[PDB]
Structure formats: structure tokens, C-alpha cells
């Protein structure tokens, strides 16, 4: 007659690759539909069950690796028997649930999968970012190994317990998914769950390889195809998104937060490249996306100069100059900024030629004639060093 | 009776990957041993032979791609028939020497390899960075496709004309060699010869993804195993090298050239990791390499903070803290610098804990007590935002 409610719990995994922090993944676990599975994962994140594997220890995913990565399919972790300590070819062969006891571990020598428990919620793998249990390839062989899907995976349907979904840090999942692997899907780099636990919102969602700052109303996923705010042929909403993300970057640029400004401008570019309609599909918006793309390439060339990323600055200025029908004032900015980057790299001939094109394109340029003179002098100083 | 001398010529290829400049490769060509082959390559770099493929054109490697990359073997380019323009599955099937004429191109419809010429200097592929001609798998089928070896390649012995070697930019060759590929060795990214020509020393050797600045006497190759200055078990000379490279970094750091200082410190670390002897092999030098490694990790954590690379700074500080027997003053520097990076990332709990360990390890710390107070206030400000 009575039914107490407990909400789906939230847990987190912090990911580091070769001790370099990437960011936090926050997962929501399906307690109603998969209660034994949810309890196991929750407690392995929380790290408070005593280990039946070694006397002075707790079971936990902390320090565990992602030992199998298959792009366009899934990423797999959780061999806490072999996959966490040091010195095997054994990684991937083990696991241990919170239901294991020391008696099982002693008696069954040959087995390295302890506390196997029942399948639950054996549904379909339709959406990316679904959490499922890895098993030994037969019913009710769940222990501690799990995966996060990165695609639709219908071949898994009915075979693996579905127990959760990623809520925050979908981009970190994609970062893992793109790691180079060998032919067996083993990552070349050391991808680790560097910490884990129970999550709530005041703990935050760190991200190191892109910016998830909501400054300027940037609510959008890093990966444009993973965003869920609008439809894939809603060009007006896509353009709104790209503009918001651009403005977020500028707010950050004004605070001298150059790395995050760069991250936002790059994200805006990715949205543009993903959603921009062809001329015959939406004439006025195609023009608007193109104009925004020019602005983004110019912003990128400037902020990357500030970060001593001169190669990157040169790349983006070149993308801009290679576009059709770039207005002369924009061309002049691209040449000036590309020139500045070549100058920092002591590419004097290249810098000079860009600065000369800058003048042709905006001859009321003010700072430019002096810049050409400065470079001309450096080239003369160089010829003197050579001569001596 | 008479014999005029002409020296082996020098040519260059500038490499860009997705329009991002990587750097310059300078090759010396073996004119005596392979004169027809040398002439072909030299003129394809110089770009001054008129093209029999299209009327308003010259034959050149400019804009041509590396269409096959095999790590631990070679990198291959030079399909100037298909591999340079736009719109095929045909890339790799074509080539055209400077000896081709328009008559051949018209008459033989089915063939896309024009001006085939004779094998020369069919030797052994022993050393990395050897230039050889790709051919069609039978004698005297050389046109424009070529490769640079990255390893010993004895399976090629006697089958491919050897016509040169890399002199500058061996690291750029390694950068190409490490590009991700599909199962057929086709690079995922667009690796291009963005320019090429005849080289001489006043033109310089640009490098964008590392530093080849000889400041401080740094004469050593970027890749430690590719350096040729000392023997692989000469630990005294290896230690001298690592120290020189470190000092080069510091000279650059003092000029506020933070990106190149970073590049030098990373290179010094790579030399250390490559050449450091085990305790039982050379006791006093093992200790000296370990001490230098601690200093390098500390320098890295500071310079990367200056570059807004907080993830990288955190990584290197963590490598230092994970070493055995780190002196307390060094530990305190690592905690302070790791804390500073967490603070920039608004990881307040993490920053606070590092700053607290900093104090424990150097309690005559001066700036640290105020820093702990500053972070304590930010945490309180955060709790107020939450409460409101």
C-alpha cells in the first residue's frame, strides 16, 4: 500500500589521461529499473564497501582505467581486480561487485570475476551516453565492468543491463572515445578514473580541454551534434546558438581569459560548420552563417596570438583569406594578424609580404607603414649578421 | 681527363597539416650517385618545368599531399597527377616526372604515370630519413612519387632508387609519421607540402611545434633517439645534453618566450627519460638525472601556468609529487604551483588542499597564509551565491 520515493542518484567520474585532467562525467543511475546494478555502481563510486580482494582496502573505481575504446560504439572500464594496480596482460579479464565475499575469492582460484549478479533492465541501446554492464557473455554475469555507449548499438540489445545515462560531461566521453588505440581497442595513453564519488550540483563540473562556462547564456553542448536544444534543420536556432557562443567568447576575451575565449570561438566555429545551410536551402541564413564564420576566424587569429599559439593563429587567418568575397577591411585584419604571427616566429619575408598586402587592402592603416619599416630593418640587421 | 665539381644540392619542403604550419624539411640530394633522380626532384621542388598535364601550369610539389604514412617504415608523397587538385579515389595512382611530354599524356589514356625513368643507386635502407623513389613495382618505373624512411627498411633493399637524405627537420618527418591513418595508411588529416624550393642557409629552418633555437648551445635533435652527437650509453654526454637543453629553456623563459621555454623543458625531459641510467649501471649519474628531472617538472609547472595551460601544469606538478624522496622545499613549490593552477580553474577545494600542504612543507612561506585566506573567502562567497 505504501511506497517511499528515492530519486535516481547522481555519481561522478573524474577523467585524467596520463595524469592530465580532462574533466568530470556526471551520471544519473536508474534506481527503479535496475536497483541491484545501480547499488553496485553507486557504491563503487562512493568507495565505502570493504574489499574481499585485499585486507586494508575498499572497492572503488578510483584509479581504474578505460581498457577498451571503440570509436562509434562504446568506452569500457571497471576491471578493479587487474586494472588498477601494477604488474598485466590480465587487464580486462577481471571484475568484482560489492556482493562478492572473501570465501568466493579464496575457493575459486581459476576465476577472476567475483560477486556476479543478475541482469536487470535488458533494453535497447538507442541513444549515445547510455550506461550498461559488461558481462561475460551469458546471463547474470555482471560484476564491476561497465561501458558508456557513444552511438546507437543495436547489436547489444537485450544482452546488457541498462542502468544509467550521462548527464554532464558528454564531451569528456567523446574525448576518451577519440583516444588512439591498438587493434584490440586498448588505448595507447593511460585513461584513468582519477577520482569518483557521489555527486551534487554544488561540487561543479570541471572541464579542462574546452569551456563549459555558461557566461553569456552558453547552455549548448561542446559537441554540436550532441546538443539537444533544437532540431538538426532548425537554422534560425542554430544561428542563434553560434552567435551566443561567439558572444560568450568575447565576454571571456574582455576578462583576459584567453584560453576559454579560444575554446568558445572554436565551439562557435564547430556549430557553424555543423549547421550551416547551403545557399539553395536557406539563402539569407547561409549568408548570415558565412559572415559570422569570417568574424570567428578573425577572433581566433587574435586570441591565439595572445596565447603564443602562432601556428594556430596563422591557420585560422589563412582559412579566412581563402574564403570567397571577403570584404577588404576583413582581409586587412587577417593579413595584419597573420603577419604579426609570422613576425613572432621570425619569418621576416612572410611577415613583410602580409603587412604589404595589409596596406594594399586598407591604405588608411595608421600603424602599418611603421610596421613595414620595422620589418625592413630586421631584415637588414639579419643581412649584417650574415655578412659578419 | 677533366671533371667539374657540383655539390649535392639542398632543397626544402614546408609542411602544413590542415593549413597549420609544422615546419621545414631540408634534404640533401645525391647528385653523383643518382643524377637523373636528383635532377627530377630538384626541379619538382623548384617548380620551373612546364607541365605536360595542363596548359597554364608548372610541375611542382607545392600543394601536394603525403598520401601514405606507415609508422616505423616511411612516409610517401608526390602524386602530382591526382594528389594536388580537387575532386579522388585516384590519389596515389598517378605521377609525372620532368621527363614526361605532352605526346605521352595524350596517347596513353589508360596510364596515369608519365615520364617513367631509370632506377639509380639501388642500395640498402639502413638509416632513417633516407629519400627513395616509389615505383610501380618493376624496374625503371620512377616518376614523381617518393618516400622518406623513418626506420631501417631492409625489405626495400635493391628495389628503390636512393637519392638523398634529410639534413634539417627530422622532427617534422616524425610529426608526419605519427599522424593518425586509416587501415590503408591514408592520413585522416590533410598533410601538405605547402611550399618547396631550392634551399640555402640564409632562408632558415622554421619549426612551429617545438623549438630549434640554438640559444644556450642547444645543438641537439628534438627527438633524443634521432640525435647523433653521442653514443646511446654515454651517460655523461647525455646528462650534459639534458642540462644544456634545460638552460636553453631558462634563457628563453627570461626573455618571456614562454612557448619556446616550454618546448625546451619538454625536450630536456625527453632526453632524461631516454638516457637516464639505472642505479646499478651508473650510481652517481642516476642521482644527477633524477635531480634534474625534479627541476624540469617544477619549471614545466610554472611556464605552463604562464601559457594558460593549467591542465598541463597540473600534470607535471603531479609527476613531481609522485616521485620518491622529493626534498620538502621542492614539494612546497609543486603544491604551490599545482594550487595556483587549480585556483585558475576555480577548483577551490583542490587549490585549498594544495596550499595547505604547501604550508606544512615550508612553514616560513610568506605569501601562503594570505593565499589560504583568499581561497577560504572565495569558498564563502560561493556558499553565499548558493544560498541566494
Amino acid at each position: 500500500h505504501h511506497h517511499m520515493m528515492i530519486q535516481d542518484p547522481l555519481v561522478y567520474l573524474d577523467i585524467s589521461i596520463d595524469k592530465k585532467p580532462i574533466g568530470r562525467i556526471v551520471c544519473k543511475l536508474f534506481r527503479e529499473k535496475a536497483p541491484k546494478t545501480t547499488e553496485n555502481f553507486y557504491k563503487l563510486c562512493a568507495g565505502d564497501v570493504k574489499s574481499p580482494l585485499k585486507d586494508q582496502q575498499y572497492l572503488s573505481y578510483k584509479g581504474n582505467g578505460f581498457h577498451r575504446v571503440v570509436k562509434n560504439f562504446m568506452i569500457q572500464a571497471g576491471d578493479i581486480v587487474f586494472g588498477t594496480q601494477k604488474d598485466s596482460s590480465s587487464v580486462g579479464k577481471g571484475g568484482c561487485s560489492i556482493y562478492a565475499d572473501k570465501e568466493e575469492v579464496k575457493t575459486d582460484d581459476e576465476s577472476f570475476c567475483y560477486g556476479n549478479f543478475e541482469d536487470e533492465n535488458l533494453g535497447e541501446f538507442v541513444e549515445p551516453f547510455t550506461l550498461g554492464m559488461a558481462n561475460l557473455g551469458s546471463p547474470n554475469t555482471n560484476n564491476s565492468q561497465f561501458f558508456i555507449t557513444t552511438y546507437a548499438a543495436p547489436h547489444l540489445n537485450g544482452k546488457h543491463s541498462i542502468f544509467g545515462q550521462v548527464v554532464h560531461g558528454k564531451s569528456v566521453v567523446r574525448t576518451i572515445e577519440n583516444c588512439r588505440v591498438d587493434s584490440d581497442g586498448v588505448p595507447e595513453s593511460d585513461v584513468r578514473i582519477s577520482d569518483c564519488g557521489v555527486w551534487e550540483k554544488t561540487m561543479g563540473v570541471p572541464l579542462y580541454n574546452a569551456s563549459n562556462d555558461q557566461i553569456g547564456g552558453d547552455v549548448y553542448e561542446e559537441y554540436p551534434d550532441d546538443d539537444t536544444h533544437f532540431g538538426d534543420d532548425d537554422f534560425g536556432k542554430a544561428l542563434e546558438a553560434a552567435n551566443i557562443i561567439k558572444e560568450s567568447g568575447t565576454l571571456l576575451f574582455k576578462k583576459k581569459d584567453y584560453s576559454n575565449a579560444f575554446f568558445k570561438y572554436r565551439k562557435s566555429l564547430n556549430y557553424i560548420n555543423e549547421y550551416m545551410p547551403e545557399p539553395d536551402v536557406d539563402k539569407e541564413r547561409n549568408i548570415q552563417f558565412i559572415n559570422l564564420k569570417m568574424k570567428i576566424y578573425l577572433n581566433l587569429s587574435l586570441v591565439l596570438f595572445n596565447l603564443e599559439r602562432y601556428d594556430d593563429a596563422i591557420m585560422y587567418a589563412t582559412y579566412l583569406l581563402e574564403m570567397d568575397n571577403v570584404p577588404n577591411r576583413d582581409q586587412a585584419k587577417a593579413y595584419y594578424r597573420r603577419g604579426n604571427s609570422y613576425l613572432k616566429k621570425k619569418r621576416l619575408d612572410e611577415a613583410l609580404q602580409d603587412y604589404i598586402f595589409c596596406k594594399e587592402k586598407n591604405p588608411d592603416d595608421e600603424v602599418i607603414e611603421q610596421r613595414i619599416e620595422y620589418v625592413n630593418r630586421l631584415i637588414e640587421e639579419n643581412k649584417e649578421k650574415t655578412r659578419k
Side-chain angles (χ1 to χ4, degrees), chain A residues 1-31 33-54 57-84 88 90-102 104-105 107-109 111-154 156-187 189-328 330-363 367-388:
Chain A
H1 49 289
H2 206 248
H3 182 66
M4 179 183 182
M5 191 216 218
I6 170 61
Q7 300 271 70
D8 287 343
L10 302 174
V11 294
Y12 76 92
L13 310 178
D14 282 325
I15 301 305
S16 303
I17 300 179
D18 301 326
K19 299 277 170 29
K20 187 188 189 147
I22 304 307
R24 184 166 289 173
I25 301 172
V26 180
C27 302
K28 179 165 89 153
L29 312 180
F30 300 154
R31 202 188 179 272
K33 297 214 291 266
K36 289 191 177 73
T37 308
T38 291
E39 194 71 3
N40 184 58
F41 198 85
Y42 183 92
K43 296 274 265 172
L44 290 176
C45 290
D48 46 35
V49 176
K50 294 182 175 306
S51 173
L53 307 176
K54 199 105 169 178
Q57 276 177 32
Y58 288 90
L59 292 171
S60 172
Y61 288 132
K62 174 176 181 140
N64 186 245
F66 282 78
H67 66 268
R68 193 165 198 239
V69 165
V70 186
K71 180 126 181 294
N72 305 135
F73 178 28
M74 45 134 291
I75 67 175
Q76 187 174 349
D79 184 345
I80 63 180
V81 172
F82 294 122
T84 296
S88 1
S90 306
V91 182
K93 290 186 241 264
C96 189
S97 82
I98 67 167
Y99 314 114
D101 53 49
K102 212 180 329 189
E104 183 187 2
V105 174
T107 60
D108 202 351
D109 283 22
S111 172
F112 306 118
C113 298
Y114 312 110
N116 286 343
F117 66 94
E118 43 263 61
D119 293 322
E120 296 171 317
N121 195 38
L122 296 169
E124 294 77 43
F125 293 89
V126 178
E127 299 306 327
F129 309 116
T130 303
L131 274 65
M133 293 302 284
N135 55 47
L136 302 184
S138 58
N140 313 304
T141 58
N142 304 290
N143 43 76
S144 61
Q145 285 200 37
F146 69 98
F147 59 86
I148 297 170
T149 64
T150 63
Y151 211 80
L156 305 180
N157 290 356
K159 287 172 186 190
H160 299 275
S161 301
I162 291 172
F163 68 98
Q165 55 184 154
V166 178
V167 170
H168 303 302
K170 286 173 181 175
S171 78
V172 179
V173 175
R174 295 282 183 206
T175 300
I176 295 169
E177 185 201 16
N178 285 285
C179 280
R180 292 168 189 237
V181 293
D182 70 15
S183 62
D184 292 325
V186 182
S189 311
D190 198 47
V191 182
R192 293 283 170 186
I193 301 171
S194 57
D195 219 325
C196 52
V198 182
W199 191 80
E200 52 78 26
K201 82 175 101 94
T202 71
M203 298 168 81
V205 184
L207 185 63
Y208 297 79
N209 68 343
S211 180
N212 66 10
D213 197 333
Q214 300 210 346
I215 194 176
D218 184 9
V219 293
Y220 303 95
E221 283 289 346
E222 178 68 16
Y223 283 68
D225 196 30
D226 297 328
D227 191 67
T228 65
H229 288 90
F230 54 82
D232 51 7
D233 58 33
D234 193 336
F235 299 121
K237 289 301 171 62
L239 182 61
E240 175 185 51
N243 275 295
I244 278 170
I245 298 160
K246 182 213 82 195
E247 284 302 293
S248 185
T250 296
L251 288 165
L252 289 162
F253 187 93
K254 290 182 188 191
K255 297 180 168 194
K256 302 191 171 184
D257 187 346
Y258 298 129
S259 54
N260 293 310
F262 160 60
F263 287 154
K264 297 300 191 176
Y265 296 141
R266 187 181 60 188
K267 175 181 176 182
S268 177
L269 180 58
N270 291 333
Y271 271 74
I272 294 165
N273 284 337
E274 183 74 20
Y275 293 114
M276 68 169 290
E278 233 93 71
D280 52 335
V281 170
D282 192 335
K283 176 149 194 301
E284 137 105 293
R285 297 207 210 262
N286 164 276
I287 291 158
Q288 285 173 293
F289 268 96
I290 286 296
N291 290 335
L292 180 57
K293 187 169 158 220
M294 295 186 201
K295 284 177 190 156
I296 282 294
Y297 286 150
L298 292 173
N299 292 355
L300 280 162
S301 74
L302 177 57
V303 70
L304 281 155
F305 178 93
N306 292 355
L307 293 160
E308 293 196 42
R309 295 174 55 164
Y310 302 116
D311 49 2
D312 294 320
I314 290 158
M315 179 181 63
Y316 289 120
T318 304
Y319 291 166
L320 178 56
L321 293 168
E322 283 180 356
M323 291 175 80
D324 292 348
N325 295 126
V326 180
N328 286 2
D330 291 318
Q331 289 196 38
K333 286 170 160 190
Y335 286 116
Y336 180 74
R337 293 172 190 175
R338 196 167 70 181
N340 290 340
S341 285
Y342 278 131
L343 178 58
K344 282 282 181 184
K345 291 298 300 177
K346 297 178 171 183
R347 290 273 92 207
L348 305 185
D349 299 343
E350 293 90 336
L352 176 61
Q353 182 58 239
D354 277 351
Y355 287 144
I356 288 162
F357 284 144
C358 181
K359 181 199 309 310
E360 293 180 5
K361 279 319 199 307
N362 174 22
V367 67
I368 223 290
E369 187 47 58
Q370 214 294 116
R371 184 52 65 84
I372 294 171
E373 293 174 2
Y374 176 73
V375 178
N376 284 329
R377 294 203 301 282
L378 289 172
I379 287 171
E380 286 311 299
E381 281 155 27
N382 243 75
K383 287 161 173 178
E384 269 296 289
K385 275 170 298 206
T386 291
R387 188 193 63 76
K388 278 167 193 145

